[PDB]
Amino acid sequence: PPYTVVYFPVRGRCAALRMLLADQGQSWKEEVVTVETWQEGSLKASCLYGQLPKFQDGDLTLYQSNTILRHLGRTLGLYGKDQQEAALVDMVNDGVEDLRCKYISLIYTNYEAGKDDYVKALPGQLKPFETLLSQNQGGKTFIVGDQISFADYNLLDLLLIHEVLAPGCLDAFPLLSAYVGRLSARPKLKAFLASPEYVNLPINGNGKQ
Ligand SMILES: N[C@@H](CCC(=O)N[C@@H](CS)C(=O)NCC(=O)O)C(=O)O
């Protein structure tokens, strides 16, 4: 296979790029790094920023989850139709990343004490994406333009993990709710999301969700 994903046995920051690969009919190798392998230290020391995911496209070695997403978007035609749409795709992805960072901070550093405030603040964090959908073909296609982009897969993952954290959090957002249902039903993505490869991994690395 042309691609290799090097990561812990977690959905985490690889869920969106895996959904992209599966939905686009791509083949890839999963190199699963156990915690004991990670703690041995040698792989970590060889990683550019000391972290995973690590990704290979042939001999091209990449780090940074959003770099991997942008690489796949650029090379597979999932980055809008022109330069203006490319910028809007980036604007969406950067917004997704900001909220993912807040989610990660809650999960790994403050779940017990922070969850109630986080969930009560979540409608204002999700509203921008409903607004974006409302401005693009009435929310009936994708987050930018009329074709899927890497930002759709990242936004879809962000929405799915927040549905687990806070069931019903999309109920006030009809376009986001329909968008999740529509994209999740795409045949290859639907089959992947139902597969043990996905279902039998935890969302995060610390048992919380
Ligand atoms: N900004 C980086 C974040 C990388 C990151 O957080 N890696 C975590 C797994 S999600 C990790 O490797 N933790 C082990 C460590 O830092 O020693 C990205 O988007 O890829």
Numbering used by the authors: 1 to 209
Publication text:
Both NQO1 and GSTP1 are well-known phase II metabolism enzymes catalyzing diverse reactions that collectively result in broad protection against electrophiles and oxidants. Using a strategy based on high-throughput chemical screening (HTS) and affinity chromatography, we identified a small molecule NQO1 and GSTP1 dual inhibitor, MNPC, that suppressed the proliferation and stimulated apoptosis in a highly passaged cell line and primary GBM cells bearing the EGFRvIII mutation.
However, it could not be fitted for the whole MNPC molecule. Therefore, we performed the molecular docking and subsequent mutagenesis analysis to elucidate the binding mode of MNPC with GSTP1. From the generated docking model, we found that MNPC was located in the active pocket of GSTP1, closely adjacent to the substrate GSH. To further verify the docking results, site-directed mutagenesis was conducted to generate several mutants (F8A, R100A, V104A, Y108A, F8A/Y108A), and inhibition of enzymatic activity against these mutants was measured. Importantly, the inhibition of MNPC decreased the most with Y108A mutant, which was consistent with the docking results that Tyr108 formed both hydrogen bonding and hydrophobic interaction with MNPC.
